[PDB]
Amino acid sequence: AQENQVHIWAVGGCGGEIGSAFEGEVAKGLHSMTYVDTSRANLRDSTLGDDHIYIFKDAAGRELDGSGKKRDENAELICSQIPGILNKHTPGKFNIVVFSLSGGSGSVAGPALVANLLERGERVVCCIVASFDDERQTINADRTFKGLMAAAEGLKRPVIVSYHMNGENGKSEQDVNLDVQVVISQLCVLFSGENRRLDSADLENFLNHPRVTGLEPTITELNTFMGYEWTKENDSPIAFCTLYPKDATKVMGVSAIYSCDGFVPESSPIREATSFVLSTDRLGGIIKQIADEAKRYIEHRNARQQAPKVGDETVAEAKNSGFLLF
Residue ranges that bind ligand G2P, judged by CB under 6 A: 12-14, 17-18, 37-39, 66-68, 100, 102-107, 129, 131, 133, 137, 166, 173, 176-177, 199, 201-202, 261
Instruction: Draw the binding track, 164-183, toward a second copy (x: CB under 8 A; -: no contact).
Output: --------xx----------
Angle at 27 between CA 22 and CA 28, to 5 degrees: 90
Count other C-beta atoms under 10 Å from residue 4's C-beta: 13
Q: Residue 81: which of 112, 119, 41, 106 has the closest Cα?
A: 112
Least Cβ distance, residue 82 to a second copy (angstroms): 7
Segment contacting a second copy (CB under 8 A): 21-29, 122-130, 177-185, 309-317? 309-317
d(CA 258, CA 48): 39
Let me know how long the chain is: 326
- What are the beta bridge partners of residue 263? 244
Of the residues 136, 231, 245, 248, which one makes contact with a second copy according to CB under 8 A: 136
- Cβ closer to a second copy: 59 or 269? 59
Contact 112, 147 (CB under 8 A): no
d(CA 26, CA 23): 5
Instruction: Draw the binding track, 98-117, toward a second copy (x: CB under 8 A; -: no contact).
Output: ------x---x--xx--xx-
Phi, psi angles (nearest 5°) of residue 157: -150, 130
Partner from ligand G2P, a second copy, none binding residue 200, C-beta < 5-8 Å depending on class:
a second copy
- Cβ closer to ligand G2P: 32 or 105? 105
Least Cβ distance, residue 184 to a second copy (angstroms): 21
- Cβ closer to ligand G2P: 102 or 195? 102
d(CA 133, CA 140): 11
Partner from a second copy, ligand G2P, none binding residue 102, C-beta < 5-8 Å depending on class:
ligand G2P
d(CA 218, CA 155): 9
Least Cβ distance, residue 166 to ligand G2P (angstroms): 5
